[PDB]
């Protein structure tokens, strides 16, 4: 998530983190990188709540199943009265998934090991090393280094249109899980997000979710009267904290019987019964650049 | 489907049957002839729900778009852990000659049709009337018959294609899966079809899927599971081959595979039927017959 070199353009990040057993959890992390030049590797790093133990291999369809599952929780919040975008389109699966090379650093040793790490990847100039320490290191360590760091390397020859993927099991320190939403720092202070996540065996944190959702800026539909609404709702077994873009259009089938659109819902949907968290931050921007940190279920 | 000489070999059948207007439908039928040593023409025939009105032509490689649409629906049902590289590891499409005949006329003039294409001997003729004709004429309906001729010297690396518009009689659509009869009583299928504007027939699908024998992965843990699930905007009736592999070498990691998904996927919203019967065998040798949507 904290990506280096800092130029690098990414989108469509998909994440899944599930309890494997009482002391193991698995992180599946998928994204799509846009650069073609790149002669050196992409070093993507991010915080996790415990040491990595082994990498896993998932089936070729997991990616779309994660995304489909997240989307079907949010669709339920929307009211999209348009069937235009229609006719699925002739794009075909063709590019094979690329795999990041994974290693792990205890948060406590990263500051003393980072330059060594860049060097093993042929990044030796002062320019690159200072960029990393200025824009990346800070999103990976804080004087209270109790969390770990996943170091993901992407060899440079990868094919543009590929999904870059990785998955591994780790051992959470103290019933914590870190969903790696944070990005490397940038000069403007505004960050763009485009990610969905599925995380199970987790406790609800209404306040952390409110803070994240209130900070979100949604995409505009460019209609005259659009308004952004903020929701902090609870149904039978779900808690929903999100924003939605809403507006009105006159009835084509009735007279003054208007249509109340409710689209681009982004936020957090928590299933109180399954203990599952669904997150969607699709094309939204925010000044908050942080991970979501939760407590796992205890027994 | 109903191919003569009864001894020819075919694979990769791609079917697309769509409503063109209120009274008209178009059938696109693609396959591949394997035999390379042919002198006397391939005669493929099958029932359609009404008379053909125009034989048509499509852009080259329409074949790939139809197959990708059906593949996309079934691929979603799978859990494959394979390492398949990036796509590729020539030939324009060849074309069948198409004409039409009703039940009645074929039953008595089939002999003639045969001779007309070099099939003069009593051997060929009795074989057609024994293996082919019974899959084409039924005394309980009228049904017309598409007559497709593939001329010798065609390319095998090419696809053999045909397409035409026809006027369905009685609001019906016949999806041409049935093959010529053979003595083993088992039928191998290798076809995908996209059929729009049709009503769901849950029972006809269940029966056809239950009869399927799936290909194997030669695994000790493989089993065939039957699925009849919904999305209540999507209905999936199919069989899948499931198995587990593991290699406690690295770490005790287990992969749960679910592949070779074959059957019927009906989109209850768009009224579209996706059918996949790829390398499956069955005792049933029958077309699928449905009702067109009446808007």
Curated annotation (Swiss-Prot), chain B:
Q: Which UniProt keywords apply?
A: Apoptosis, Early protein, Host-virus interaction, Inhibition of host caspases by virus, Inhibition of host innate immune response by virus, Modulation of host cell apoptosis by virus, Protease inhibitor, Suppressor of RNA silencing, Thiol protease inhibitor, Viral immunoevasion
Query: What is one GO biological process annotated to this record?
Result: symbiont-mediated suppression of host RNAi-mediated antiviral immune response
Q: Which Gene3D superfamilies match?
A: Baculovirus p35
Pfam families from the entry?
P35 (PF02331)
Disulfide-linked positions: none
Q: What's the superkingdom here?
A: Viruses
MF annotations from Gene Ontology: cysteine-type endopeptidase inhibitor activity; cysteine-type endopeptidase inhibitor activity involved in apoptotic process
The similarity annotation says: Belongs to the protease inhibitor I50 (p35) family.
Role noted for this protein: Functions as an inhibitor of the host RNA interference antiviral response. Inhibits the insect host cell apoptotic response initiated by the viral infection. Blocks as well the activity of members of the caspase family of proteases. Required for late and very late gene expression.
Q: What is this protein called?
A: Early 35 kDa protein
Q: Which organism is it from?
A: Autographa californica nuclear polyhedrosis virus
By which gene is this protein encoded?
P35
């Amino acid at each position: 998530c904290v990506i280096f070199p800092v130029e690098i353009d990414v989108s469509q990040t998909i994440i899944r983190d599930c309890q494997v057993d009482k002391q193991t959890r698995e992180l599946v992390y998928i994204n799509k990188i846009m650069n073609t030049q790149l002669t050196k590797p992409v070093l993507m790093m991010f915080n996790i709540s415990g040491p990595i133990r082994s990498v896993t291999r998932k089936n070729n369809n997991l990616r779309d199943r994660i995304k489909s599952k997240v989307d079907e929780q949010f669709d339920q919040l929307e009211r999209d009265y348009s069937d235009q975008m229609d006719g699925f389109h002739d794009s075909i699966k063709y590019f094979k998934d690329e795999h990041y090379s994974v290693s792990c650093q205890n948060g406590s040793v990263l500051k003393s090991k980072f330059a060594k790490i860049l060097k093993s990847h042929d990044y030796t100039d002062k320019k690159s090393i200072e960029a990393y320490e200025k824009y990346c290191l800070p999103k990976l360590v804080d004087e209270r280094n109790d969390y770990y760091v996943a170091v993901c390397v992407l060899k440079p020859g990868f094919e543009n249109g590929s999904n870059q993927v990785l998955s591994f099991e780790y051992n959470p320190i103290g019933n914590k899980v870190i969903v790696p939403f944070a990005h490397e720092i940038n000069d403007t202070g505004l960050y763009e997000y485009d990610v969905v996540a599925y995380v199970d065996s987790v406790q609800f944190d209404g306040e952390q979710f409110e803070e994240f959702v209130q900070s979100l800026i949604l995409p505009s539909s460019f209609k005259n009267s659009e308004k952004v609404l903020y929701y902090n709702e609870a149904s039978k077994n779900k808690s929903m904290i999100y924003k939605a873009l809403e507006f009105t259009t006159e009835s084509s089938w009735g007279k003054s019987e208007k249509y109340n659109w409710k689209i681009f819902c982004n936020g957090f949907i928590y299933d109180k019964k399954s203990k599952v968290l669904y997150v969607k931050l699709h094309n939204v921007t925010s000044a908050l650049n942080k991970n979501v940190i939760l407590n796992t279920i205890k027994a």
